[PDB]
C-alpha cells in the first residue's frame, strides 16, 4: 500500500517498474502503474518508479546497428563498414587504404584502423583498398613467356 | 567473425531486414511473413538477421586465394532455413521454416 | 543443396538441433533456451536448423581450389544470429538474438 | 446441429477437423470435437470428420530428415548423406566413388548417383571418394627439380 506517500526507490512503499517496463501512472494518490515496453520502439534498462519507457536510439550516419533495440536494451550502434571509431576524437574516420604496392595486414574494424604493409617480394598489390592482402606473383611456365616482370604494384604478365 | 593473420576468400555483409513480407518455405510454397508476433501481450517485432556477399569478385578473377590459373570462381550468397510466423493465403497462421540469406561462399568451376 | 559443373571450396552438412539448452546472445551473455513456445492454443517446439563444416581440410592442404603453394587455408564453421525464446537465470522470458552455426567458409593465411 | 445423425464429409451436418487438427470425439450423439495437433509430435494433413491427428513419421536408417514434421505435414525423409534413392529398387545404395585416377563431375544427389570422369591431362586424383573433382597438377618452377611427373593417380612431387 501507499495511501498518498511515495517513499521511493528501494524504499518499499511504491512499486518500481522492472526491466522491460516503464511507468505509465506514477505514485499519484494511488500506486505506480507499469506497462510493458514495446519491442523495438521502446525500452527500459532500469528498475525505477519514475522512469517511463524510453524511445529506441537510432544509429544514424557513419553508424550501423549491431544490436537491435529490445525491450530491456537500447540499440547498440557501431561505426559502419569502411570506418573505425577513432579514440583520439568522438567520431569515425574512413578506414585508410593500403595503396598500390601495399596490402592488408590487420583489417579496419573497431577502434582500429587498417594496418598495411608494403608487399614483400614475389607479391604485388595493384589496388588501393582496405580489404586486399598482397597477392602472390604469377610465375610463368616454360610453355609461356612473360612480358612484364612482377613488381610490388603489378603482377607479372604472361603468354 | 573477426580476423588476425588471416583473410576470407569471399567477403560478406550483414543487415537487419525489417520489411520482409513474403518468402519461400521448406515445402517450396510462397508464404506471407507476419510483421509481428503476439506474446503474453506486448507483441515482439518479426525481423531477420541476414548476411550476403559484398560482391561476386573480391579480386580480379573471383574468390581471393584461388588458383585462377586452373579454376574459375565466384562468391555466391547462400541461404539457410529459419523459423517464421507466417500465413498462407491469409489462412493458416503458424511457424514455418523459410529460406533467408545467411553467408557468402566460394564456388569453383574448371577452366 | 547444390548444382552441376561447379564444386564447393569447403563442404558443409546440415542438421536439426532439438536439444539446445543454452546459447550466447548478442549482448554476449549466457541465456537458457526454452524447449518450446507458448501459442494461443498448442505450444510449438523450438529447435534450430544448423549447418557446419564436414571437415577442416577437404583436400590435402585445406580448402578445395586454393593455390596451396602460396596460401594456407582452412574450412571454418561460421555462426550467425537467430531469434530464440529465452530466459536469463530463469527470470526474463522473451526473444533474444543468439549465435548458431550457419555455414562453412574458407579462411586464408600467407605461407 | 446433428441430433444423432452424421451426414458427413462435405455433407454439411458434422463438422470436419481442418488441417493441423484431429478428431478428439466423433459425431457420437453430439457434434464432432477437434483438438489441435502437437507440433513435431502429431499432424493432420487432411480435412476430415473421422481422422485423429497422426503420429509424426520417423526418418530412420539410411534416412535423414529434410523437412520437420509440422502440424499439417508429416516429416519428409530423404536418403542420407552419401546415399541416393535408387529408382530400380525401394531403397538407397551408397554413392559410388570416383576411384583413383578419376574425379567428380556430378555430385551424388537424390535419385542421382555420383558421376565421375577419368582425369584429363595435367590433372590427377589420388583418392577414392565421391566428392573430389580431378585436381590440377603441381607444375615445377625453374628453380625446383621434381622427381615424379604428374600422373592421373598422383601429383608430381617436388623439391
Ligand atoms: C485508484 O486506484 C483504484 C485501484 O486500482 C482504481 O480502481 C481507482 O479507480 C483509482 N482512483 C479513481 C477513483 O479513479
Ligand atoms: C453434448 O454436447 C454439449 C455441447 O458441447 C456438451 O456440453 C454436453 O456435455 C454433451 N452431452 C453430454 C451430457 O455429454
Pair (A17, A90) in one structural domain: no
What domain range includes position B31?
Answer: 1-111
Contacts of A139 in chain D (CB under 8 A): 141
CATH assignment at residue C10: 2.10.90.10
Minimal Cα distance from A138: which residue of D? D141
What is the distance between the alpha carbons of residues D40 and B10, in angstroms, rounded to a whole number?
37
Please give the DSSP secondary-structure letter assigned to residue B82: E
Which chains are adjacent to chain D, needing at least 3 Cβ pairs under 8 Å? A, B, C
Q: Look at chain D and report how many structural domains it folds into.
A: 2
What is the distance between the alpha carbons of residues A48 and A46, in angstroms, rounded to a whole number?
6
What domain range includes position A97?
Answer: 81-159
3-state secondary structure D70-110: ECCECCEEEECCCEEECCCCCCEEECCCECCCEEEEECCCC
Pair (D27, D55) in one structural domain: yes
Residue A102 near residue B50, CB atoms below 8 Å: no
Residue A37 near residue A21, CB atoms below 8 Å: yes
What is the distance between the alpha carbons of residues C99 and D157, in angstroms, rounded to a whole number?
43
Minimal Cα distance from A142: which residue of D? D142
User: Which of D40, D132, D138 is the closest to C45 by Cβ?
Assistant: D40
DSSP for D25-58, written as a single string: E-SSSS--EEEE--TTTEE--S-BSSPPPEEPPP
Q: Distances from the Cα of D120 to the Cαs of C42, D101, D103, D136, D156, in angstroms?
A: 59, 9, 10, 9, 15
Closest CA to B79 of B49, B44, B103: B103
Please, which residues have CB within 8 angstroms of residue D134's CB and are 6 or more apart in sequence? B110, D102, D103, D104, D117, D119, D120, D123, D124, D125, D152
What are the residues of chain B with a beta carbon less than 8 Å away from any beta carbon of chain C? 1, 5-10, 14, 37-39, 44, 49, 51, 63-67, 69, 71, 73, 78, 80-82, 94-95, 97, 102-109
Pair (D72, D85) in one structural domain: no
Query: Which domain-ending residue is among D35, D61, D80?
Result: D80
Pair (D1, D75) in one structural domain: yes
> What are the strands of the beta sheet with C22-24, ordered from one edge?
B6-8, C94-110, C71-87, C30-33, C22-24
| Exposed / middle / buried, residue D80 (Cβ in 10 Å: 0-12, 13-18, 19+) | middle
Measured in Å, residue D49 CA sits from the centre of ligand 2 at 18
Breaks (C-N over 2.5 A) in chain A follow: none
Q: Chain D closest CA to B87's CA: distance in Å?
A: 13
Pair (A71, A98) in one structural domain: no
Cα angle value A43/A47/A52 (rounded, 5°): 45
Q: Distances from the Cα of C87 to the Cαs of C21, C25, C42, in angstroms?
A: 11, 11, 20
What is the distance between the alpha carbons of residues C84 and A151, in angstroms, rounded to a whole number?
52
Nearest ligand by distance to the CA of A3: 1
Instruction: Please tell me whether residue B44 adopts helix, strand or coil conformation.
Output: strand
Please, which residues have CB within 8 angstroms of residue A51's CB and are 6 or more apart in sequence? A17, A22, A23, A44
Residue the block writes with cell 551408397 = D94
Pair (A73, A87) in one structural domain: no
User: Which of A66, A73, A133 is the closest to C110 by Cβ?
Assistant: A133
- The experimental method behind these coordinates is X-ray
Resolution (A): 2.6
Nearest ligand by distance to the CA of D24: 2
Nearest ligand by distance to the CA of D28: 2
CATH assignment at residue A113: 2.10.50.10
Please, which residues have CB within 8 angstroms of residue D27's CB and are 6 or more apart in sequence? D2, D5, D6, D8, D13, D14, D49
Residue the block writes with cell 521454416 = B97
DSSP for D125-155, written as a single string: ----BSS--PEEPPP--TT--BSSPPBTTB-
Question: What cell numbers appear for A143 in the block?
Answer: 610453355
Pair (A17, A56) in one structural domain: yes
Amino acid at each position: 500500500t501507499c495511501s498518498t506517500g511515495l517513499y521511493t526507490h528501494s524504499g518499499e512503499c511504491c512499486k518500481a517498474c522492472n526491466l522491460g517496463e516503464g511507468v505509465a501512472q506514477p505514485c499519484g494518490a494511488n500506486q505506480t502503474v507499469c506497462e510493458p515496453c514495446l519491442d523495438s520502439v521502446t525500452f527500459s534498462d532500469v528498475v525505477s518508479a519514475t522512469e517511463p519507457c524510453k524511445p529506441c536510439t537510432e544509429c544514424l550516419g557513419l553508424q550501423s546497428m549491431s544490436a537491435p533495440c529490445v525491450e530491456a536494451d537500447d540499440a547498440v550502434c557501431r561505426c559502419a563498414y569502411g570506418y573505425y571509431q577513432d579514440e583520439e576524437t568522438g567520431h569515425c574516420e574512413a578506414c585508410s587504404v593500403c595503396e598500390v604496392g601495399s596490402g592488408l595486414v590487420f583489417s579496419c574494424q573497431d577502434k582500429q584502423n587498417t594496418v598495411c604493409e608494403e608487399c614483400p617480394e614475389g607479391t604485388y598489390s595493384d589496388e588501393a583498398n582496405h580489404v586486399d592482402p598482397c597477392l602472390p606473383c604469377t610465375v610463368c611456365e616454360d610453355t609461356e613467356r612473360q612480358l612484364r616482370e612482377c613488381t610490388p604494384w603489378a603482377d607479372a604478365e604472361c603468354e | 567473425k573477426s580476423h588476425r593473420g588471416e583473410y576470407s576468400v569471399c567477403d560478406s555483409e550483414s543487415l537487419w531486414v525489417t520489411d520482409k513480407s513474403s518468402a519461400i518455405d521448406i515445402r517450396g510454397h510462397q508464404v506471407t511473413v507476419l510483421g509481428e508476433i503476439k506474446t503474453g501481450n506486448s507483441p515482439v517485432k518479426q525481423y531477420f538477421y541476414e548476411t550476403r556477399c559484398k560482391e561476386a569478385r573480391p579480386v580480379k578473377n573471383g574468390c581471393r586465394g584461388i588458383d585462377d590459373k586452373h579454376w574459375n570462381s565466384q562468391c555466391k550468397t547462400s541461404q539457410t532455413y529459419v523459423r517464421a510466423l507466417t500465413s498462407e493465403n491469409n489462412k493458416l497462421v503458424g511457424w514455418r521454416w523459410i529460406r533467408i540469406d545467411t553467408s557468402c561462399v566460394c564456388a569453383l568451376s574448371r577452366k
